[PDB]
């Protein structure tokens, strides 16, 4: 259901951080992403429903 991260990034992140292929958040970390949602960085708190498995999948595709 989770895909490989590409759909999750496109649906939840690309509007603010760019298409995955040219994302400004390449090389991010799970700790940065969880902290950004939890701290509402840039208004990101609405993403608090994403699970650890979903956030990690997004981190991993940004590492490729
Ligand atoms: C617009 C409503 C955004 C959504 C959707 C996403 N991000 Fe975001 N994020 C946004 C801003 C304005 C900021 C602060 C400025 C900055 O770009 O740093 C952030 C912050 C982050 C961070 C923390 C900063 C860092 O360590 O680089 C991360 C890790 C981050 N954003 C990642 C990220 C992810 C993975 C998103 C989809 C789940 C996502 N953001 C969505 C604006 C918006
Ligand atoms: Na806000």
Author numbering: 1 to 64
Give the published text.
PgcA has been shown to play an important role in EET but is unusual in containing three CXXCH heme binding motifs that are separated by repeated (PT)x motifs, suggested to enhance binding to mineral surfaces. The amino acid sequence of PgcA contains a cleavable Sec signal peptide followed by an N‐terminal lipid anchor and four domains interspersed by repeated (PT)x motifs. The first domain is not predicted to contain any cofactors, while the other three domains are monoheme domains (Fernandes et al., 2023). These findings show PgcA to be the first of a new class of electron transfer proteins, with redox centers separated by some nanometers but tethered together by flexible linkers, facilitating electron transfer through a tethered diffusion mechanism rather than a fixed, closely packed electron transfer chain.
The 1.55 Å crystal structure of monoheme domain I reveals a globular arrangement comprising residues 261–321 from the PgcA amino acid sequence. The heme is enclosed in a peptide fold consisting of three short α‐helices separated by flexible loops, with the CXXCH motif located within the first α‐helix. The axial ligation of the heme iron is provided by His274 on the proximal side and Met301 on the distal side. The imidazole group of His274 locates within H‐bonding distance (2.8 Å) of the carboxyl group of Glu281. This interaction could influence the properties of the heme group, maintaining a suitable Em to facilitate the transfer of electrons onto low‐potential minerals. The structures of domains I and II are highly similar, with a root mean square deviation (RMSD) of 0.453 Å and share 53% sequence identity. This suggests that PgcA domains I and II likely arose from a gene duplication event and that both the heme axial ligands and the histidine coordinated acidic residues are important structural features of these domains. Domains I and II possess two acidic residues, Glu281 and Asp372, which hydrogen bond the proximal histidine of the His–Met coordinated heme.
